[PDB]
Amino acid sequence: VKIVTVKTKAYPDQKPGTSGLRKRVKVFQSSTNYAENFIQSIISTVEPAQRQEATLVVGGDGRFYMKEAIQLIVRIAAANGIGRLVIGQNGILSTPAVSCIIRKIKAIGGIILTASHNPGGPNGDFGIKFNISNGGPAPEAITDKIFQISKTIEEYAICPDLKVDLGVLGKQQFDLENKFKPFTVEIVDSVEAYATMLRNIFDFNALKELLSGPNRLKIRIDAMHGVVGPYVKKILCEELGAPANSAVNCVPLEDFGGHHPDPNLTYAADLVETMKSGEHDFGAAFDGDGDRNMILGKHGFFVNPSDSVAVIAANIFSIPYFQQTGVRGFARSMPTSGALDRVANATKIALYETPTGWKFFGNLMDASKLSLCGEESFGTGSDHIREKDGLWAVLAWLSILATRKQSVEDILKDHWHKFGRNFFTRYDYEEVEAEGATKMMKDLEALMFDRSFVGKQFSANDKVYTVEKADNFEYHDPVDGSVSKNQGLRLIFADGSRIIFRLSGTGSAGATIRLYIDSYEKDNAKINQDPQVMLAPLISIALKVSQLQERTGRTAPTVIT
Amino acid sequence: VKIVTVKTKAYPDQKPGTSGLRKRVKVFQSSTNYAENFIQSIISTVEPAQRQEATLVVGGDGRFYMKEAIQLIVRIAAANGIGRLVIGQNGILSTPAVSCIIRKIKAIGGIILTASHNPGGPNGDFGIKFNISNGGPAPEAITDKIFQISKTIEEYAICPDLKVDLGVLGKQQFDLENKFKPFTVEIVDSVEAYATMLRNIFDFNALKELLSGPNRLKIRIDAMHGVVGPYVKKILCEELGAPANSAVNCVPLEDFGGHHPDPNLTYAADLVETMKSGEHDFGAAFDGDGDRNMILGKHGFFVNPSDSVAVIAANIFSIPYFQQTGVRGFARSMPTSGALDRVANATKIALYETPTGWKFFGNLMDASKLSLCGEESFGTGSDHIREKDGLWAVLAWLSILATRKQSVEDILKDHWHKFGRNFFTRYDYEEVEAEGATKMMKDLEALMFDRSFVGKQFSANDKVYTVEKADNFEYHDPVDGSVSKNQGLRLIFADGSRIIFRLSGTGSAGATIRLYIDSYEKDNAKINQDPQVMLAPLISIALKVSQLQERTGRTAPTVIT
Ligand code: VG1
Numbered sequence A, B: 001v002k003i004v005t006v007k008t009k010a011y012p013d014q015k016p017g018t019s020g021l022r023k024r025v026k027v028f029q030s031s032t033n034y035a036e037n038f039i040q041s042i043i044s045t046v047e048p049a050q051r052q053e054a055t056l057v058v059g060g061d062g063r064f065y066m067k068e069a070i071q072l073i074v075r076i077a078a079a080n081g082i083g084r085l086v087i088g089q090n091g092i093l094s095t096p097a098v099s100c101i102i103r104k105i106k107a108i109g110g111i112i113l114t115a116s117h118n119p120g121g122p123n124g125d126f127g128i129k130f131n132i133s134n135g136g137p138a139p140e141a142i143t144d145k146i147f148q149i150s151k152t153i154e155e156y157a158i159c160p161d162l163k164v165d166l167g168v169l170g171k172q173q174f175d176l177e178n179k180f181k182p183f184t185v186e187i188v189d190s191v192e193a194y195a196t197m198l199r200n201i202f203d204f205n206a207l208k209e210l211l212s213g214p215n216r217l218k219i220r221i222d223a224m225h226g227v228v229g230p231y232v233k234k235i236l237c238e239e240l241g242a243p244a245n246s247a248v249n250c251v252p253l254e255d256f257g258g259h260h261p262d263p264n265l266t267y268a269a270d271l272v273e274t275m276k277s278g279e280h281d282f283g284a285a286f287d288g289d290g291d292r293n294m295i296l297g298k299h300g301f302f303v304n305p306s307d308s309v310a311v312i313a314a315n316i317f318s319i320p321y322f323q324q325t326g327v328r329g330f331a332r333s334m335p336t337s338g339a340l341d342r343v344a345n346a347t348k349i350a351l352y353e354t355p356t357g358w359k360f361f362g363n364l365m366d367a368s369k370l371s372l373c374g375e376e377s378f379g380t381g382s383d384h385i386r387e388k389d390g391l392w393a394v395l396a397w398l399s400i401l402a403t404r405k406q407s408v409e410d411i412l413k414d415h416w417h418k419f420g421r422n423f424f425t426r427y428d429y430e431e432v433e434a435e436g437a438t439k440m441m442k443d444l445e446a447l448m449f450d451r452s453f454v455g456k457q458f459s460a461n462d463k464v465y466t467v468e469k470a471d472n473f474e475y476h477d478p479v480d481g482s483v484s485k486n487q488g489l490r491l492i493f494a495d496g497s498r499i500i501f502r503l504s505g506t507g508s509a510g511a512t513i514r515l516y517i518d519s520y521e522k523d524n525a526k527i528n529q530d531p532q533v534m535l536a537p538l539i540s541i542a543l544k545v546s547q548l549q550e551r552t553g554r555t556a557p558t559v560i561t
């Protein structure tokens, strides 16, 4: 195979976000070699005297253009001196699977072709995630460095005539002009290593008994036409024995059928209506790249992803992985509710509040202080790997149900009566007013500096809510010293209740007021019923503050979750 | 899992020969003790200290009792301290494949569950073959230890509770009672290691333009319902590109479709009929083990097994394996035609004539003195593994077609034109009277050893045959030193023609007589003729000197090849 140094011209907009670089597919196809440069800056962070004995795991969620970008990573990494590429069969390879492979075969980093929860039709979105040696997301330093190379790039080394059959399992060698050691491409099965990893984490026999034994827990699983389909089929059906009727929407389609892979009460309507039938005890849908999960109960019941980590923590020892390693620490993103906190507060385990993104959880994990973490964006995980994991979280819920023997509804009613209830809703104001929320979200910072307000008696609706705290958010990583940026306000008090007033930082075209609300109830009666209605006191104080409707301008709902 | 010991009673008939233990299915089935007993002695030949750090490859052919016999192997090997078992997917692993996997990963040996060539049903046949560290079939020194132990087995260690899921890929780990290190079961892909091996031997790229480009060679390969089916679909149909409709009967059926998977024009009648119509350019029939093959050309042109090895040898530097590592030696069995001699003699490289039996090819391949070996019983192999390979032979044939850009007919036609034709045929006498055939060989032997016979002139038309050499074949193996006596009665004639008699019934039940006739013709007008017409005078001479009709009561042979 030939090697040719193709001169190119840099791009401005090639910068990664909270997780990887994502753009509209047109920006990939119409732009004269956009992916070739972003790929070349990635391999450039790996020093020349280190590439010949290095292995890059390249994966993918099956999305449109995945096939062409994989061909580019092979031809570009080949001409740049990378010794081996471990691609999954057909390119299909989950984000928790890529995190898992990297840690297993000691790979110096990994590239994932996925825009996650972003839609994927031929007119939708496509993206490039870059995981580092430790297995998880490259933290800001490495990503912005990729950005810093994307601006001053002048050329890129490529082997234009290197065509590889990604469908066939096996090792293949390629010899390129003057380089003693041959370029190797090792195509691995997609599910294998990942299933062998989950095998030593849960009791696969105790689960086998729960899904196809003495009564059969009727589960309904929606893979949402994304990469986790083959996994539910080979793992939950073919291995653990769940009936084929359980695995719905499990064939990876480029278009994802049309729907958006983000699993939630709006973007995932199909499964909730069929869960309202009452014949299913448990139900679960997944993200596009399979690292997010949504838990549902009998009759369409819903477990908030902020509550889901709280239950898989009070019952954490139902999972063998934790009986052998121990619970070194709990964590949650600042926007996720305070339910995990109530469980962490009742035991000798430390708790950590991190910025939204899986990239900074890893630092707590590597330094041995975090074991269970997750966020409101349907993303529960643990330190078994360094990425989020949708199927680990589903199988963590089946381990709890099988040991406890109760329904999903009763586990949480008991959990709410045992600690109290933390209400939550992601009720946003997506792209809305061009001049209102400027001064409004700069009005509270200063105004509260008066010594007479620490003690407010009430006369609205019912039940007194005593005063205590109130402030803002920033983050200093305890392991390497990284810092964060101002962005989201949060009004708190005695027990624990809050509105994360989110001003956008990267919002150029407009500001999304992505709202995260939290209400902590103590009593038996006011906890078990109503969702965005028992939240009223929090959205009473939060709606009265700035005279918002006549001082900013927005009273029409947008996208509730 | 609990390890328990069962006191057992031994069996005097459990004796492993060249191809392991071949008994009928209804002797392992309900005879409480038979399968467990034999496996126990197999893993007893490996020292108690050499077991924890050791692996054994296990596989079968996909028919009756194979799956049941693999659950038995894991339960006994585990209680006996074997570290790792590498089992193919579903238990399906072809014989050439097991030799490849044992030598690749360097296992201590391997257990092959295949019945050689007899059918595999409820009342049919079932066998246990044990290969050793170099990937070859165990020899006398080791089969006797196995038999000496199996007839004195008092106690046997088993894990009754060990349940292995054979269909799911990946490493399953089992912890046993009272043991600090765990037992490992690793399920491997059936084709993979074996395909990656062929990928280095042949040129898969030159074979892609050959089977699926514009100038496309239409083939037709019948897997005969045996284990070689999965390998033909993945290598020939998936990776090389041949249309899926070319690989026919490629699904290992539980019964094999009633008939024996053996390369014989009648056994492979479907293949012969579909190739007579005119359309197909290359055809092939197989066996339920993966060790033999029946090559056919346009319109039904038959390629003789003996000529096959002389065509591959004269065009051997076409297969990259040979261009890169050289040809250390050629070898054929004694009954095989002298067609390989005309090639090895002109292209001056050491030729080795050995007794019927792969075991003799292996020795020369372990002492690095043998590269390509051929055998009249539909076989052709090399030092790529340490067993016979039916698909390697097909792959070496397609390689020669792509390189020479001629039809099967013309490559044999112009070979006969440049080296001459060794008309060959093999008459078999099936159920013969055990003593009347033995006294037939002895009087023939006394007829050969007196001073006068080494110059006798025989005739049946125009050509006279002058006896040059006459001997009962003795082999002194240059590796084991061991001498193999008897072996066969050779009447070598002065013109290169030979008549060979072998009695294969000298150990149990009724005897079979195999009469091999080989005749050399060098003028181009006579090489175009029919073999049974051409060999007619030499056959009258064979039945005359033998007085076969007289001693066996047989006026015609059972099978003519
Ligand atoms: O603030 P953002 O950009 O919307 O971030 C959201 O999606 C990110 C990537 O998601 V996946 O789409 O990588 O599962 C997640 O890691 C964050 O937890 C989630 O809040």
Ligand SMILES: [Co+2]
Residues within 6 Å of the ligand: A116, A117, A287, A288, A289, A290, A291, A292
């Ligand atoms: Co995701």
